[PDB]
Write a protein that binds this DNA or RNA. Structure first.
Length: 138
DNA sequence: GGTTACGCT
């Protein structure tokens, strides 16, 4: 069952639809910052005053960092782009040192958890709630 | 495994 990002908590597995706001690749992992334009008390409060010029929104507690390791990394690093919509399934949540929610995709060759992330065509009806909520913060 | 909300690789 899918959760809105507002509904996810730490130390569970969850699935959701989101829009990709920011990507960062490194030689250790691939990082996504995603939002569905719902607020979560454990998300970082992105500041409109000091955040990178490049981050245009959403501001406040509206986005979550996803760390993609291993195959998830190799698959998505030159595939998932800022602006894409994605569907993430059975991913892990945790809490970073500072106490903020974060989503993790660990390498899972034995396919124990059946995790996955895929692009969702911008015209899928599943994205309509995201698009309407987005209008409120732009 | 990797740190912090920027970097723009």
């Amino acid at each position: 069952s899918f959760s809105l990002l507002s509904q996810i908590t730490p130390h569970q597995r969850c699935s959701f639809y989101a829009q990709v706001i920011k990507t960062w690749y490194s030689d250790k992992n691939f990082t996504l910052y995603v939002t569905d334009y719902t607020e979560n008390e454990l998300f970082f409060p992105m500041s409109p005053y000091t955040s990178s010029s490049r981050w245009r929104g959403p501001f406040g507690r509206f986005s979550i960092r996803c760390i993609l390791w291993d195959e998830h990394d190799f698959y998505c690093r030159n595939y998932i782009k800022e602006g894409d919509y994605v569907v993430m399934k059975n991913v892990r949540t945790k809490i970073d040192h500072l106490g903020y929610l974060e989503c993790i995709l660990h390498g899972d060759s034995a396919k124990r958890y059946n995790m996955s992330i895929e692009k969702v065509d911008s015209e899928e009806p599943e994205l309509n709630e995201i698009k309407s909520r987005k209008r409120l913060y732009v």
